[PDB]
């Protein structure tokens, strides 16, 4: 609201918090990113380094559906199983009946390896897996089989 603005506190004081000498004007320094290479160079090198230039190639008509690849680490791998049955599979780690974690149905494209899943085998259907994640699933006894 406006009744708390300093503008209401600045009533009476001649310059409205903007200075006698400076004389708050329209646009003393330019407009927008103006003079970024000329008189705002220090600002655009201290706080925005890398602002000016042409790095990289150009991907014409990039579609982010191609680059959709949300990554699920191993610590979160056990979040996909519903909480109701999570305990029932943590206990009595069964090689002959292993839980299947369909990360794709849960909205993840790749499995990463942030590490330390419990020693219980899981069948992990996923599009992609990192080397370390694959070796950690095997170490726990599960398997990762690829899908699309």
């Amino acid at each position: 609201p406006s009744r708390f603005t300093k503008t209401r506190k600045h009533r009476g004081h001649v310059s409205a918090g903007k200075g006698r000498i400076g004389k708050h004007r329209k646009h003393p320094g330019g407009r927008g990113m103006a003079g970024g290479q000329h008189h705002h160079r220090i600002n655009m090198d201290k706080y925005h380094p890398g602002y000016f230039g042409k790095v990289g190639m150009r991907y014409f008509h990039k579609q982010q559906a191609h680059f959709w690849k949300p990554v699920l680490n191993l610590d979160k791998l056990w979040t996909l199983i519903p909480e109701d049955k999570r305990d029932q599979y943590l206990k009595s780690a069964s090689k002959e009946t292993a839980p299947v974690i369909d990360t794709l149905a849960a909205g993840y494209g790749k499995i990463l390896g942030k590490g330390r899943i419990p020693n219980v085998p899981v069948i992990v259907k996923a599009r992609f897996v990192s080397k370390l994640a694959e070796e950690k699933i095997r170490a726990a006894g599960g398997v990762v089989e690829l899908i699309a």
């Binding site: 009476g12 004081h13 001649v14 006698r20």
Partner: protein, 127 residues
Amino acid sequence: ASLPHPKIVKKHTKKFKRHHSDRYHRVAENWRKQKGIDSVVRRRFRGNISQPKIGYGSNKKTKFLSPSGHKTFLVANVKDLETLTMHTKTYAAEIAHNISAKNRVVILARAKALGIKVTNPKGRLAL
């Protein structure tokens, strides 16, 4: 009557009249701080008007106390007044301006019967 109080010392009794309120009719007597870059009143030159300072603040024990020694309490009806039944030694009721003359005689009826001082018992009389 009223509880003992230290002798009232206002520490400044002249009202702070805005600088040049006399000179210009457009400048009202209400106090405004002179925020000029050159005003002698702001700079506290000798021989110029005193400005309100927190030094002039009255004693805490005697703030909002009338010269009689009561905190005035603006009262509208009998119900508002009967909240001073157990505070008569400090609060002196004051009948609001908009209370009709017929309703005043009943307000002072209770105030007299309760021993509560009224700051304006003579307003809107019938005579």
